[PDB]
Amino acid sequence: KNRAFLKWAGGKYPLLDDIKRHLPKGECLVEPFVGAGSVFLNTDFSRYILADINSDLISLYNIVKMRTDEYVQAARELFVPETNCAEVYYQFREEFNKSQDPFRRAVLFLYLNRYGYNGLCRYNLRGEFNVPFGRYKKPYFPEAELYHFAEKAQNAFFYCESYADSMARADDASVVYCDPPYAPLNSFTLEQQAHLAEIAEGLVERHIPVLISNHDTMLTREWYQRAKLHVVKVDELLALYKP
Numbered sequence: 001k002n003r004a005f006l007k008w009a010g011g012k013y014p015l016l017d018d019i020k021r022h023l024p025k026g027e028c029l030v031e032p033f034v035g036a037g038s039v040f041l042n043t044d045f046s047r048y049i050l051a052d053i054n055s056d057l058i059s060l061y062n063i064v065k066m067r068t069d070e071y072v073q074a075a076r077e078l079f080v081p082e083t084n085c086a087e088v089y090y091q092f093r094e095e096f097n098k099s100q101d102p103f104r105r106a107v108l109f110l111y112l113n114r115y116g117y118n119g120l121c122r123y124n125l126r127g128e129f130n131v132p133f134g135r136y137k138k139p140y141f142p143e144a145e146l147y148h149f150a151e152k153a154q155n156a157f158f159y160c161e162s163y164a165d166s167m168a169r170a171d172d173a174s175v176v177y178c179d180p181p182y183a184p185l186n187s188f189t190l191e192q193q194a195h196l197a198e199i200a201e202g203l204v205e206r207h208i209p210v211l212i213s214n215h216d217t218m219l220t221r222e223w224y225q226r227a228k229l230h231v232v233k234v235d236e237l238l239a240l241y242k243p
């Protein structure tokens, strides 16, 4: 398995094998909620369309893809011993929330991901990144994973859009994998949870396959009723809409 250079909520690898197991074959793979990229990094599709509502995440990715070397250097500089204390963490966080330069924010973003509390990515109502210091003993600088990501991203495209817009890019050779925010065991609402299933129902009729991942609850079985369901031992459900 290829680790993702970022720390993202949930953890896709913790189910990775079973996903490749029901993931239809095809030319292009479409991930409406790319996330940390666990699925992307661990598959061999010809092309990739990766999207996410988080702008900071996509900016980062496009940069890692286009300016891999330049980045890795600037990034590496922040993982020295001189920056491993709350004192600095809150300084870099502030520099980030105030920055207007895409590149500088992409660098700080990684540092925040690694030195921040539980590697969370959260913002307050003002739109500022508001995660606290994680007090980690020795943060790991993902240099190996950055490059691997960068190399594989050469056959990928990153978009910053909602799930509906990205899934609307899938063609006959495309195959859709959806990893939306987990169901109840702004924010991703129940109304949208259903809208996604509704869209899946739509694509599958155009003969475009779609695989959805989510908890296994009364609500998920309800939304994904029109799909071959397979439980994975709260549990984990995989919904497959096969043409």
Ligand SMILES: Nc1ncnc2c1ncn2[C@@H]1O[C@H](CSCC[C@H](N)C(=O)O)[C@@H](O)[C@H]1O
Pocket (backbone or CB within 6 Å): 009, 010, 011, 032, 033, 034, 035, 036, 051, 052, 053, 054, 161, 162, 163, 164, 179, 180, 181, 182, 183, 188
């Ligand atoms: N409307 C929307 N369209 C596309 N991506 C969205 C979205 N709402 C949230 N996201 C994105 O969805 C991604 C989910 S990441 C994977 C999450 C996981 N299985 C969990 O539930 O914890 C995040 O990266 C987030 O930025």
